[PDB]
């Protein structure tokens, strides 16, 4: 007994917040338990009740530390495997990353308690979702952002699936936070009205999820094929292995050359500069056009700037019928949002010589234009997003065009190894496909290579960590979703209104 005495202790709540914070990771990874997200948000909402601003900030920081150290720890695997640093240094780096990610949850909890101290429906339903949206935007914007582990992505297959195509995964985050706050308030106050309101709010989008915003045109059906080279990441960036990788990809492509129409290779499938492999690319494009196919592969390009400086762009070249290959062609995609510490190392003067982990091969990339024309191959338009860029919903939507028939994503998940990072990335890609209502053609070296339907459901998939070829027929779709039409503008208007109302009520509370 005496639960009230123990629960009203800051030290105990810190330990209890760690468990509830880590409980949220059961919704993104292959665990895929969407009630866990609601439970974790309920814990975060409840454990900050009746606390001073500093204690609430500590509770939020511990919750974020659990969440981002129990499901972002797969970064440590990549760091240790492909970087020469001691184990204490690696664990310090992953702990520091978790703490940095948890700062924006501690800030959320602190501001929420500072402005709305008393546990009320207002705080748990209006102020909390708006402030949570603001802090998530800050986390995804500052220092190029790391918008990972957003609970809306857990609703890719759930009751709130249909909310994504209308307003987005960020609005799904908003609704999840609101419902979970109402549930936490009902649990804390032992009341039934917040529970009923939360049930109504959560069950409202279930009929909404049946709306079909896309027309599955079958007249433009193709036979896309994707190749998993299963190239070892350690040997990926070498000299002798380049010929072996090219031979493997060519031999995998040759049977498909003639039967398939949209052969795709993973990110950085060709591990050499585009200019160096010019005759090979020319011959490959010629023989692909002879048999009537296309090859949207990935390569590394080093263009010359106006200042005679070589800028390295992570690129997606296009070859075959419907898109003749040329070094000056505009039918290419340059990666815009580079991955921190892996593609653009900040402070190269000190960080790069500090350890071999910072001085990874093929680094110091150059960002491409934010908005780029869609890739054309065999008469169809593909929206490209290299690896990490897929999770950026706003950038993907901005690059999206009404003429887009497929969403293209190529990644190299061999860094993460056997962990949950590739699965979380795949889930975020599925959420993007659901939001834009376009079929997704995701190709990976070792990670999850699959074709995602317009509703986010997996149409085809191949086992992870193998050298397989995913050959299937995918039908394009036409039509603009409300999310594609608008963006985050409706969500930002809604959260601005809610925040303004909450601030006015807090000031008027006096
Ligand atoms: C006030 C300062 C506070 C600082 C707070 C941060 C401190 C901690 C920072 C260190 C810990 C994070 C380290 C993450 C990078 C580890 C190395 C990963 C390598 C990598 O980036 O993958 C590349 C691209 O990723 C891909 O193409 C696919 C993977 C994309 C997902 C990557 C997820 C991990 C990155 C998370 C970084 C978050 C930083 C947020 C600040 C490989 O791609 P490639 O095959 O073409 O090889 C070409 C490579 N040269």
Curated annotation (Swiss-Prot):
Q: What is the effect of changing residue 237 to A?
A: Loss of activity
Principal cellular location given in the protein's record: membrane
Effect caused by changing residue 145 to A: Loss of activity
Q: Which domain of life is it from?
A: Bacteria
Its EC number is 2.3.1.269
Tell me what topology the record assigns in the membrane: Multi-pass membrane protein
Q: In which pathway does it act?
A: Protein modification; lipoprotein biosynthesis (N-acyl transfer)
Name the phenotypic consequences of knocking out this gene: Essential. Depletion induces juxtapositioning of inner and outer membranes and alters the architecture of the cell envelope. It causes mislocalization of outer membrane lipoproteins. The mutant has a copper-sensitive, temperature sensitive phenotype.
GO molecular function list: N-acyltransferase activity
Q: Where are the membrane-spanning stretches?
A: 10-27, 34-48, 53-68, 87-116, 121-141, 169-189, 192-210, 488-508
Write the protein's name.
Apolipoprotein N-acyltransferase
Q: Which organism is it from?
A: Escherichia coli (strain K12)
